[PDB]
């Protein structure tokens, strides 16, 4: 019964009636001295009637798998890095120092791009200067700053070639008949593209350009193309080093926007597709690694005033591939409209239908879509409107559900006139009409 | 505190004692059948004799009321006063009243139980003494006049606070009021203890399980946008899911299946919690509708599982338990259904557990992954552990024809996994 | 160096430093004696008022202090001081040079464990006097019997025995005959705390991995085990008012409450104290009461109370979580700036490196209050950043 006996309590002999506390554990009025084991049992029963015996001691001593795992765990969700893809409906986004806070901008920030490799952010606006900022968390400083006189800029892009990844050009352009190209060398050697090689009537302003990669497809030689959106339906594609007009692609209607998709073919060969949208909603896809010939023509379901198309989930022009084997096919395609409606198509199945239905039509912000950008992993789309204040949403996808905890009513987004995603850090830059790039870090990355 | 507060406390203690005629009239006019002017003039003998008639009717319907005729409805209980015996006799007759109430909770659609519990209302004052068990037992019947009647005569507990605008009202409480009632945490602990006594004494009936599961999944739906409320709420509803899975009723088992599937799709639970949940699901699986719900539940609970480790081989104990509850024909047939459930990550984990733990049933994994389509990472992990199977054991025709399937679709991927580990000419020389 | 203008008076603003405090009970009231460096301070547990401060500073830091009815036993560098109302009544010099670092008091015996694993027993002279005063014997826990002594307790109804909790073992000595009655089996991880349960002959052991053992000191077995993964256990306390709850205290600053009857987990108070200053260092239920006093190394002493249950019939299954009650505190970091608030020398403003501005009272330590940092509204009506 017991695991020890000490053989001293049996031969001890206590008094009882000397103190008032032990005066109660007698069983007679003639008891004065009792044996030790008797005395131990008397005050054991007295302890049991001071503190009554609970049921957990004598009840039990030590299909129940769920009960056991709940009684051991204290947190009940995935911990830190065994997630690898974003949780919906609640972001995790801290605010860093405003990127152009070191050197203020004298205009609305019209375009904004990160570097493909270096920690550099290029801002530029209608005050005809363009600024590069070394960004980090604390102290986003200004690397360099170039003021092109008489040339307000509207689109500015870091281009970095695929062959040697050592060029680092900046192409910039506004409402002018020329487009500048700064060659980054850390004086500054910039060149000016001002010759459409016979095609000046169909290109009266170099505002809306995009830079992309193109393969020769008889050699494995890539070169950058700039793509200019012109008047009638025209996209004029021209070489990014020589400026020679390579080809042109005409859509039927009012050309409003376009984007560049890539798809790999074999080891070291890919194919460039230009995706251009009418104002009405009908979309042309041109294969342009051959002559600029149409391969697909489909129609956006709904959508009547179409302002902005974007692809994402692979290599876009804003998440660019540094190495030719890292070129990916884009999964998602968002067509954002004048009413604020953004149709979202999933190109893993919506390349075949020719009247494809969107996987969801987002309707959360109600005025004209002027930016929509995909995060480099292709899990967030960023809708943004330069028409009212604070009109920016980050929609999670594949779930196609807007994050409900950011932005709040106190986010200093401003009148969002540009947006950019970092290719590596998981990091938003949001430029507003006051001239401020605000900077946020998504803690999933 | 104040004197009027301390006197409100002594009034709430002495609520049931009739200290004069006016309090006796106001306290005895609280009936469940009659109105106040008839109920105040009735006797104990009259209401006892027709309650004993109704208990004989209720007992010939369901024969577990005969012992209540022995003790709670006997003729010594006409003269038994409640507030004259001590706390130990009070707890004896209050668990007698709790036994009667959770036995007769199912019978509340037929008038003998109304005329029988009329005598518990008027002799033992269970509308004001044993009132929490009365509300919890008849909570299902909230669109019905019998719950309207007990709300009119009840004195409402502090946990049931949101029903206080539906007492002495002509309209029933609504479903959104029921979800607001269930949305509390202390009410959730109270209701789960009530269900624990129900599951223990084997009185869970299907209308109760439907109502309970509906309110539970609406609580989870309401709290689906605050993770701290979901995290307060997890060891309550997963504990009641474990205690519903640990019983014999197919209805309460698939009630727990519903709670588990809604809760796992509401928040991403831990991998080990999901595995222990499927162990508790399989450890008492005896019915057929329970088997249907159990396969769908295990598929969705593995679907809602993210990160590094979603599609491992599920371990040897749980895989052979899942084998003993669901053999090959069941899994293959359920995948051959034209409604197309989403069984991606679970079927991947299943085939990887077959390749680590069976090593004989590989023709069936060829047939089932011929049936359903998987993703690139799924089939990449499948062909990597088939490559490891080829390198551990000698490569016969079933592994060869598996690699013929993985050559006939997506041969570039099996080339990519062989080039990540091995070589194609060396593997063709192997097999 | 001694001075001739200014003489030392007190060191204000100190409540605890993370020595495990002692509770004591005069009649039906409770006092809480906490160590502040080299003095202790007695607090009235019903209102956390400073009753007493020890009269002289000890020559080194107080390292283990206990409290029976009127007397407080404070062990510092070598010796044990027996104090009543602050004023020291006796001083027990040990015969070693080892630092005394644990003690228990039961019967006529005071037992003080040093850090060379020797135990010094002291005896009363005649059982009517007030404190144990004369040397009796010496006990030794050698490396065969057990590890370093990690606690020293006397669980009740054990006639002149002593439960010695070593890092791996539990020994049981008879302190009159100097004998080792019973040595338990080993424990697979190092045990850090011990607390005697109000259940008869049961002690509760807390390990450096996360488990609470409920050792039955007469059967030699363990009754049950409670697992709290990746948490070092620094306190154990038991509720003794007809509700069988246990409260464990975790060195990441957490206070976890368990029901032992129905084996569930009642509630967790997270970040009850700072982990960087030691976590919850001593948590104890005032017995018979639903209030538990915690104290941490961040110069803070709190009380938490259990309200009565909100369900009028169930009760035992609907346990309302513990809420906060009174607390005293000071700076958790050394102060960086000092000013006097008024000409009367009553309040003094004091700012510290832990980024708090306190207002400390030189007249009555209950009046010390942290100046709040809750901002006003903006004057125009715009948003504040």
């Amino acid at each position: 019964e017991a695991a020890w006996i000490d053989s001293d309590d049996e031969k001890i002999k206590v008094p009882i009636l000397v103190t008032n506390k032990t005066k109660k554990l007698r069983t007679s009025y003639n008891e004065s001295k009792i044996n030790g084991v008797h005395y131990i049992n008397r005050l054991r029963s007295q302890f049991e009637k001071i503190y009554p015996r609970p049921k957990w001691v004598d009840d039990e001593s030590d299909i129940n798998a769920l009960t056991k795992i709940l009684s051991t765990t204290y947190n009940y969700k995935d911990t830190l890095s065994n997630s690898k893809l974003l949780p919906p409906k609640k972001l995790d986004i801290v605010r860093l120092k405003d990127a152009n806070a070191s050197h203020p901008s004298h205009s609305a920030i019209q375009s904004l791009s990160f570097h493909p490799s270096k920690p550099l952010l290029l801002t530029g606006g209608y005050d005809k200067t363009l600024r590069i900022y070394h960004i980090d968390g604390k102290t986003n400083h200004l690397v360099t700053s170039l003021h092109l006189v008489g040339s307000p800029i509207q689109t500015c892009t870091f281009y970095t070639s695929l062959s040697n990844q050592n060029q680092q050009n900046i192409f910039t352009a506004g409402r002018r008949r020329y487009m500048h190209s700064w060659d980054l060398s850390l004086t500054a050697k910039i060149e000016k593209f001002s010759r459409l090689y016979g095609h000046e009537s169909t290109q009266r302003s170099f505002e809306n350009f995009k830079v992309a990669h193109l393969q020769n497809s008889q050699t494995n030689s890539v070169h950058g193309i700039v793509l200019l959106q012109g008047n009638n339906g025209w996209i004029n594609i021209l070489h990014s080093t020589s400026g020679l007009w390579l080809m042109g692609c005409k859509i039927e209607g009012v050309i409003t926007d376009f984007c560049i998709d890539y798809q790999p073919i074999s080891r070291g060969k890919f194919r460039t597709i230009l995706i251009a949208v009418n104002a009405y909603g009908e979309v042309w896809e041109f294969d342009l690694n051959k002559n600029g010939h149409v391969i697909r023509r489909w129609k956006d379901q709904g959508g009547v005033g179409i302002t902005k198309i974007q692809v994402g989930g692979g290599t876009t022009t804003t998440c660019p591939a540094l190495q030719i084997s890292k070129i990916k096919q884009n999964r998602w395609l968002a067509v954002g409209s004048e009413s604020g409606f953004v149709n979202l198509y999933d190109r893993n199945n919506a390349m075949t239908s020719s009247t494809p239905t969107p996987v969801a039509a987002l309707d959360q912000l109600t005025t004209t879509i002027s930016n929509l950008q995909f995060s480099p992993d292709g899990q967030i789309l960023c809708m943004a409107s330069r028409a009212v204040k604070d009109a920016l949403r980050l929609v999670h996808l594949p779930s196609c559900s807007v994050f409900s905890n950011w932005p709040t009513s106190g986010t200093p987004l401003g009148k969002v006139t540009s947006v950019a995603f970092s290719p590596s850090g998981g990091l938003l830059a949001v430029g507003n009409e006051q001239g401020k790039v605000r900077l946020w870090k998504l803690n999933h990355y | 505190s104040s004197l009027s507060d301390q006197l409100a406390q002594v009034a709430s203690n002495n609520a049931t004692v009739a200290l004069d005629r006016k309090r006796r009239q106001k306290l005895h006019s609280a009936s469940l059948i009659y109105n106040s002017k008839t109920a105040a003039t009735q006797d104990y003998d009259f209401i006892f004799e027709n309650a004993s008639k109704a208990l004989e009717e209720l007992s010939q319907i369901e024969p577990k009321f005969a012992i209540f005729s022995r003790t709670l409805f006997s003729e010594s209980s006409i003269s038994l006063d409640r507030n004259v015996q001590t706390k130990e006799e009070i707890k004896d007759l209050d668990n007698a009243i709790n036994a009667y109430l959770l036995l007769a909770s199912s019978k509340w659609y037929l008038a003998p139980t109304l005329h029988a519990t009329e005598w518990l209302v008027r002799r033992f004052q269970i509308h004001v003494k044993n009132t929490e068990m009365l509300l919890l037992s008849t909570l299902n019947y909230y669109q019905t006049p019998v719950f309207k009647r007990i709300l009119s005569i009840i004195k409402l507990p502090p946990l049931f606070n949101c029903l206080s605008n539906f007492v002495r009202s002509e309209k029933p409480p609504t479903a959104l009021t029921m979800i607001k009632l269930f949305n509390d945490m202390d009410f959730l602990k109270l209701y789960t203890s009530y269900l624990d006594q129900c599951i223990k004494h084997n009185a869970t009936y299907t209308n109760q399980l439907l109502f309970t599961t509906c309110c539970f999944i609406n609580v989870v739906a309401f709290n689906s946008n605050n993770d701290e409320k979901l995290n307060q709420l997890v060891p309550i509803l997963l504990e009641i899911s474990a205690k519903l899975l640990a019983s014999k009723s197919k209805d309460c088992q698939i009630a727990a299946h519903t709670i588990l599937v809604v809760f796992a799709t509401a928040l991403p639970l831990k991998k080990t919690i999901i595995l222990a949940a499927m162990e508790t699901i399989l450890s008492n699986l005896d019915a057929k509708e329970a088997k249907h719900s159990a396969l769908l539940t295990i598929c969705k609970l593995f679907q809602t599982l993210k990160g590094q480790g979603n599609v491992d081989q599920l371990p040897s104990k749980i895989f052979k338990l899942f084998d003993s509850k669901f053999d090959t024909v069941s899994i293959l047939t359920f995948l051959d259904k034209e409604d197309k459930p989403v069984c991606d990550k679970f079927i991947t984990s299943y085939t990887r557990s077959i390749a680590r733990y069976d090593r004989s049933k590989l023709n069936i994994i060829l047939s089932l992954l011929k049936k359903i389509r998987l993703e690139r990472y799924e089939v990449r992990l499948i062909i990597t552990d088939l490559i490891y199977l080829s390198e551990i054991l000698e490569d016969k025709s079933q592994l060869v024809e598996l690699f013929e399937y993985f050559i006939s679709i997506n041969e570039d991927l099996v080339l990519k996994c062989l080039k990540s580990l091995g070589l194609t000419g060396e593997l063709f020389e192997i097999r | 160096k001694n001075s001739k203008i200014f003489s030392p008076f007190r060191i204000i603003g100190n409540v605890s430093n993370g020595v495990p405090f002692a509770t004591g009970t005069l009649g039906s009231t409770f006092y809480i004696v906490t160590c502040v460096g080299k003095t202790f301070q007695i607090y009235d547990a019903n209102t956390l008022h400073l009753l007493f401060v020890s009269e002289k500073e000890t020559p080194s830091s107080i390292v283990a202090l206990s409290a029976h009815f009127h007397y407080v036993y404070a062990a510092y560098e070598n010796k044990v001081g027996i104090y009543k109302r602050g004023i020291e009544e006796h001083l027990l010099e040990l015969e070693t040079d080892a630092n005394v670092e644990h003690l228990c008091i039961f019967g006529d015996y005071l037992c003080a464990s040093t850090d060379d694993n020797s135990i010094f027993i002291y005896k009363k002279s005649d059982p009517q006097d007030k404190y144990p005063s004369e040397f009796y014997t010496k006990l030794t826990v050698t490396e065969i019997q057990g590890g370093e002594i990690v606690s020293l307790q006397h669980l009740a109804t054990y006639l002149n025995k002593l439960t010695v909790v070593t890092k791996s073992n539990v020994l049981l000595f008879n302190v009159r005959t100097g004998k080792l009655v019973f040595t338990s089996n080993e424990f697979p991880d190092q045990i850090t705390t011990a607390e005697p349960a109000p259940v008869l002959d049961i002690i509760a052991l807390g390990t450096v991995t996360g488990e609470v053992i409920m050792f039955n000191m007469r059967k030699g077995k363990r009754i049950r085990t409670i697992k709290i993964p990746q948490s070092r256990i620094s306190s154990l306390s038991f509720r003794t008012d007809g509700s069988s709850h246990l409260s464990v205290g975790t060195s990441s600053g957490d206070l976890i409450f368990y029901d032992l009857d129905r084996r569930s987990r009642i509630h967790v108070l997270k970040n009850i104290h700072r982990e960087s200053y030691g976590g919850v260092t001593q948590a104890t239920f005032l017995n018979g009461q639903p209030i538990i006093v915690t104290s941490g190394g961040d110069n803070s002493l709190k009380e938490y109370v259990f309200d009565p249950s909100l369900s009028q019939g169930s009760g035992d299954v609907v346990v309302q979580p513990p809420r906060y009650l009174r607390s005293r505190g000071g700076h958790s970091q050394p102060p960086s700036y000092i000013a006097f608030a008024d000409s009367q020398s009553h309040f003094m403003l004091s700012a510290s490196k832990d980024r708090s501005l306190w207002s400390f009272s030189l007249r009555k330590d209950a009046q010390s209050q942290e100046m709040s940092q809750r901002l006003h509204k903006k004057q125009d009506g715009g948003r504040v950043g």
Binding site: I50 | - | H154, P290
Partner: peptide, 28 residues
Amino acid sequence: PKVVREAKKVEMTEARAYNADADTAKAA
């Protein structure tokens, strides 16, 4: 109306405690 999480005013009570001074015996 939601349930009323209000706190009561807490007063301590009179508790009995075992004191261990009776747990020590002398030999003749």
